[PDB]
Amino acid sequence: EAPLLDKKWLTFALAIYTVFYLWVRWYEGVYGWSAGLDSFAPEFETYWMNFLYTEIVLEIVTASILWGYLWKTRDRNLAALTPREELRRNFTHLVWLVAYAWAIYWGASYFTEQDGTWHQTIVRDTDFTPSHIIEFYLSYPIYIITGFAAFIYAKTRLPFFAKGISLPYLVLVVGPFMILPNVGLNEWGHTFWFMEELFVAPLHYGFVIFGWLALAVMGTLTQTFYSFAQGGLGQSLCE
């Protein structure tokens, strides 16, 4: 008779992102000045290019392992899922959504405007600035991994989402992912199209457009609520 909501998992989901991104901010503060200013220097290499390579390799490994583990341990027979266990799985999926929202805030909101700050205070020299390394290649893949994991868990554990591919969930999960390829346009926007460090330039409208797809969350939320209510919780609550 485990509790319906696992408080330890929710606390971990918040705390791991909080601590990791606080350490990332500390690293940016410590080494963003001594080594990050000049891109053709050895300290810049050993303090940011190594970071980029390590983060890319770790992101690939983590995404592969997590997605493969979630897809391998799927519930083959969901017809025997008891309503209480279905409610517990719904709470776990809600914890996954909480983690995805926290990662989305950390990526799209915090580090994007930090990148804006960085570009307004220095002269851009390379596409692999420390700000670009942290924002485009660390936070965006992290929230992409979290969203893919949440979608896979919902599809493989919740009977509500197991009957097909949820269009609002697919838009909410893949839409922000398209922000990562669009970075190329951003680079093509800064190197060829726009000669000025203007944050409202059209070369950034790609980001904006895919950010709009995050609004799909509302539709997803509705489905989630029905997944919470179809198991008998709604009937008891309406009384």
Binding site: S39, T121, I122, V123, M195, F225, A229, L233
Partner: protein, 382 residues
């Protein structure tokens, strides 16, 4: 920082910064440093850079470690964008005030609209002290002296916190009840009208009226407190006075200019005609912030950034007094690690292999003539 990654020919063919001075190398907090010099606009302006019809004199540094107290182009203060003419030389002066301690690489730059950044030579300046001692006093036309570091901070905090608290209260008034699932079921069941009561309507009306009235009263109070206000001052300042410089009594033609691609040097054949000004001798070749000097003819005493100063990087086949009238063809060799360090050797990736730079000629009395050269640069691979 940011020049090494810029195309070599773009750096060679835009703006040339010649004799520069820094008043101090180490400053304390609140102390001022003056950077003066001359900048020449190259006649063969690249086509992908818009003409400097709208240009801004800027200071390149990792942030507000200094504050730009003032900037003058031709003796005229230039807080706004200005208009520069192709082929003219201008004096510039920048007075900065130290704000944050540490070692800072400071550059003078010309931001050009439709072109991008044009960074000049950077110098390392050390600031000693504490940032807490920095003050920025400004006296207004209303008779008030304020400190720009903390002026109007509390008012902004108060108003933002007030409006955020109002929004939080508006959300929390509705947040005391069941939020998502029961309300969704009631709306689906057709009982939506039961979710809003008359008291809720009265609360919404009060919120709207209070918001409008508070905004109006706050605007009136702000107008009363500050009855004298002006809009933001902006515009492009034309009519910058250029330098009226002695035309070079020295004529230089570039026969050939080549660079070995592996390579840390550049070589050029030059025909030089002296049109008076006594026997002259080449003492320096300036390319892209890099100065190659002939120690026997000239020595820098201005503290030019050493990473960009090659004291004996100019090798002239015959650097003997060029008697007025003599037309000598000489082979000059500009060699220095800066060629590779500042990635000037990356002209091999450029869609335009042409260079431009400045040659400095000195007579027996020390008078200096500046000659401007431009040519195509041919890589050597054999």
């Amino acid at each position: 920082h940011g020049e090494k990654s810029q195309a070599a020919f773009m750096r060679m063919r835009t703006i040339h910064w010649y004799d520069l001075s820094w008043s101090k190398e180490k400053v304390k907090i609140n102390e001022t440093v003056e950077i003066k010099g001359k900048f020449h606009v190259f006649e063969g302006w690249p086509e992908t850079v818009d003409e400097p019809d709208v240009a801004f004199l800027n200071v390149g540094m990792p942030g507000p470690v200094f504050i730009r107290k003032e900037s003058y182009i031709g003796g005229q203060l230039v807080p706004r964008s200005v208009r520069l003419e192709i082929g003219k030389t201008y004096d510039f002066r920048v007075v900065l005030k130290a704000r944050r301690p540490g070692d800072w690489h400071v550059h003078t730059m010309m931001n050009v609209q439709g072109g991008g950044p044009i960074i000049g030579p950077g110098k390392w300046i050390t600031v000693e002290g504490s940032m807490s001692e920095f003050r920025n006093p400004v006296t207004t036309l209303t008779g008030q002296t304020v400190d720009l570091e903390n002026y109007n901070e509390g008012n902004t905090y108060f108003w933002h916190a007030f409006w955020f608290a109002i929004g939080v209260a508006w959300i929390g008034y509705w947040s005391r009840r069941p939020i998502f699932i029961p309300r969704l079921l009631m709306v689906d069941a057709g009982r939506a009208d039961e979710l809003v009561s008359a008291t809720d309507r009265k609360v919404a009306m009060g919120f709207l009226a209070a918001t409008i009235l508070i905004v109006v009263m706050a605007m009136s109070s702000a107008n009363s407190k500050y009855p004298i206000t002006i809009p933001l001052q902006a515009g492009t300042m034309r009519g910058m006075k250029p330098l009226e410089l002695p035309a070079p009594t020295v004529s230089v033609k570039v026969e050939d200019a080549t660079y070995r691609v592996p390579g840390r040097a550049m070589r050029m054949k030059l025909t030089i005609t002296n049109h008076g000004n006594s026997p002259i001798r080449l003492g320096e070749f300036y390319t892209a912030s890099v100065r190659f000097l002939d120690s026997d003819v000239y020595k820098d005493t201005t503290g030019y950034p050493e990473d960009l100063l090659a004291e004996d990087g100019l090798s002239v086949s015959d650097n003997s007094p060029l008697a007025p009238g003599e037309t000598r063809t000489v082979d000059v060799t500009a060699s220095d690690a800066a060629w590779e360090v500042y990635r000037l050797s990356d002209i091999i990736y450029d869609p335009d292999s042409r260079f431009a730079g400045l040659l400095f000629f000195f007579d027996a009395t020390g008078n200096r003539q500046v000659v401007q050269i431009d040519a195509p640069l041919i890589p050597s691979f054999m």
